[PDB]
Amino acid sequence: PDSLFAGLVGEYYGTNSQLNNISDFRALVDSKEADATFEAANISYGRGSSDVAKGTHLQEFLGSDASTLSTDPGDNTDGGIYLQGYVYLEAGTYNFKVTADDGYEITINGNPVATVDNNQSVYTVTHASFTISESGYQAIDMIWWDQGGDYVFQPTLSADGGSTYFVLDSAILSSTGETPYT
Ligand SMILES: O[C@@H]1[C@H](O)[C@H](O)CO[C@H]1O
Ligand SMILES: [Ca+2]
Ligand SMILES: [Ca+2]
Ligand SMILES: [Ca+2]
Ligand SMILES: [Ca+2]
């Protein structure tokens, strides 16, 4: 049985190898069990300095979500997160606008909808629009990593053509696709 909560299933992975791109982080996820798990209920993390994978920087980064950490990871030089679950969206057009250091990839219903395939100091990209064909819980996943140094990750989503944006949080997230009453 998987727990039902108003959030995405979060996994954190650390490494002492360099993360240069999405492929490197995905390979890290493939390589071992998560160094920690958590509930991603308010997906607006950071900013901080001095490596997300060192000390208590991950806790600080995750903020409001860190109280659900399964463990306190040890130090690593590089690290990142893999989030998966569901997001309630009505049928229509949407686009992400994401602030991040380093890179990331967000997919909805298996298709990438926001990609930065490289390291970067903090930068905000307004991504291309995508459509949702049927109202309901949509499958969503995210990866994000830090190669070192500073770190931040705030995807925001617009339903109104880029006029307003919102953070993905417990209002609309579901870990399993069932309706959370938590
Ligand atoms: O956080 C930043 C970014 O990772 C950049 O790519 C290299 O410098 C680090 O300090
Ligand atoms: Ca794994
Ligand atoms: Ca730690
Ligand atoms: Ca590094
Ligand atoms: Ca960084």
Author numbering: 10 to 191
List sentences from the manuscript.
MpPA14 (Marinomonas primoryensis PA14 domain) lectin is a domain of a 1.5-MDa adhesin responsible for a symbiotic bacterium-diatom interaction in Antarctica. Bioinformatic analyses indicated the presence of an ∼20-kDa domain near the C terminus of MpIBP that is a member of the PA14 family, which is a carbohydrate-binding lectin module widely distributed across several kingdoms of life. PA14 domains share a β-sandwich fold and the presence of two consecutive aspartate residues in a cis peptide linkage (DcisD). The DcisD motif coordinates a Ca2+ ion that is directly involved in binding polar vicinal hydroxyl groups of various carbohydrates.
We further analyzed the crystal structures of MpPA14 in complex with three pentoses, l-arabinose, ribose, and 2-deoxy-ribose, as well as inositol, which has an unusual 6-carbon saccharide ring without an endocyclic oxygen. These four carbohydrates bound MpPA14 more weakly than glucose and mannose. Crystal structures showed that MpPA14 selects the pyranose form of pentoses for binding. As pentoses have a higher percentage of furanose present in the conformational equilibria than do hexoses, selectivity for the more thermodynamically stable pyranoses might contribute to the weaker affinity of pentoses toward the lectin. For instance, despite l-arabinose existing in solution predominantly in the pyranose form at 25°C (57% α-arabinopyranose versus 30.5% β-arabinopyranose), only the α-anomer complexes MpPA14 via its 1,2-diol. The same rationale can be used to explain the even weaker affinity of ribose and its derivative 2-deoxy ribose for MpPA14 (se Fig. S5B and C in the supplemental material).
